[PDB]
């Protein structure tokens, strides 16, 4: 009934919350942690997917794509850039966290806000592989037995069935499973140190934050897998094999996580919580 607004609530949050996270890290100098530079990237990707919230909405109601190619080419790419940039940023966060608590001496030269921006730029280039290509191959095509307009990437019709199923697998495997694996390895090697080590760095304060931020990252990673696992096994079940509203539900979760992350940093960081309070409400 009133879902037409709760969809706008999330839309504003993910578009304002992430913009806020990006601006705070840019302007305020104290907020240039190696980890925060990664969150800037993640926020950026989340802001972009949030920009496609309306477009995906109108498709829900109308059921046919009514925009132009120039928008189908831009949304389809504003998407691949998000699917890859986000998961490659979490996987680096968790690796950055690994070499922060399981390699404290080497980290004295390996973890720096310049090195992190480099890995962030590197991630957008690797994501451009599939991201720029979507702008090229992105186009609209009238469905055959539907008489509706479809927006999707265009492949040579010679062996469509093959390259489709192969791409889907490589997406699921290399953008949903090899990344999660790395994180699970990262994080096991890490709680094993934290269950027995007395002090990770020289200060108790370093060790206070080293443990604390790694818990934030673990919660961000946790929310991500929970929201992103249903859609990934759904794109893969329909490939190897009907009034299925599951597709919009699994997209609902994925758009929740886009808007949930600005709030998670505000809740799981005493620094983000402090920078917001001294920005929105300067006492």
């Amino acid at each position: 009934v009133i879902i037409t607004a709760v969809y706008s609530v999330v839309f504003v949050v993910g578009l304002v919350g992430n913009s806020l996270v990006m601006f705070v890290i840019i302007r305020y100098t104290k907020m240039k942690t190696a980890t925060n530079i990664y969150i800037f990237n993640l926020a950026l990707a989340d802001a972009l997917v949030t920009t496609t919230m309306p477009f995906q909405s109108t498709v829900y109601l109308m059921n046919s794509w009514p925009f132009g190619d120039v928008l189908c080419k831009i949304v389809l790419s504003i998407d691949y850039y998000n699917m890859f940039t986000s998961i490659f940023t979490l996987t680096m966060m968790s690796v950055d966290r690994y070499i922060a608590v399981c390699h404290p001496v080497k980290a004295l030269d390996f973890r720096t806000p310049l090195k992190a921006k480099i890995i962030n730029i590197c991630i957008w280039l690797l994501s451009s592989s599939v991201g720029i290509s979507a702008i090229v191959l992105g186009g609209t095509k009238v469905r055959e037995d539907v008489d509706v307009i479809e927006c999707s990437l265009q492949f040579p019709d010679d062996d469509y069935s093959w390259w489709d199923l192969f791409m889907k697998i490589c997406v699921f495997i290399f953008a949903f499973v090899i990344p999660v694996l790395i994180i699970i390895v990262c994080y096991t090697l890490m709680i094993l140190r934290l269950k027995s080590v007395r002090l990770l760095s020289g200060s108790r304060e370093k060790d206070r934050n080293l443990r604390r931020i790694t818990r934030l990252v673990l919660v961000v990673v946790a929310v991500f897998v929970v929201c992103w696992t249903p859609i990934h096994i759904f794109i893969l079940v329909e490939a190897l094999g009907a009034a299925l509203s599951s597709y919009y539900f699994c997209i609902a979760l994925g758009y929740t996580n886009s808007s949930l992350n600005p709030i998670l940093y505000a809740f799981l960081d005493e620094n983000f919580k402090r920078c917001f309070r001294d920005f929105c409400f300067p006492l």
Partner: nanobody, 115 residues
Framework: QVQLQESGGGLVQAGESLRLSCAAS????????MGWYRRELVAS???????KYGDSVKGRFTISRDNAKNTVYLQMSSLKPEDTAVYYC???????????????WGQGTQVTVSS
């Protein structure tokens, strides 16, 4: 959220021997270093039983640990009158795996050597 239980101080004549114990009780995840302070160090011991003694304790004191019972024991021997002070117990604990490293002090047990 940590309670310590101390014993074994009091009035004692010189060249007599005491024994202190300290029991770390509470809701904790893992204890790290237990030891006795007076505030300079007198004796401390890790989870792995490696001990460190103050300079004023020329082998006279010896500190054991029972990790099973979260208790540390200080065997003070050959007491001198220059040992009279308040002996504070110390217990490093962590309230959880992601949480901060912080210790808790004891009430203290008075030891007096005379004559």
């Amino acid at each position: 959220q940590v309670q310590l239980q101390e014993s074994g101080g009091g009035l004692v004549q010189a060249g007599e021997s005491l024994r202190l114990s300290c029991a770390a009780s509470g809701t904790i995840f893992r204890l790290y270093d237990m030891g006795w302070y007076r505030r300079e160090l007198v004796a401390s011991i890790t989870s792995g039983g490696s001990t460190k003694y103050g300079d004023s304790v020329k082998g006279r004191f010896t500190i054991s640990r029972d990790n099973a019972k979260n208790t540390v024991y200080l065997q003070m021997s050959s007491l001198k009158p220059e040992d009279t002070a308040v002996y504070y117990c110390n217990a490093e604990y962590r309230t959880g795996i992601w949480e901060e490293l912080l210790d808790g002090w004891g009430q203290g047990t008075q030891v007096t050597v005379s004559s």
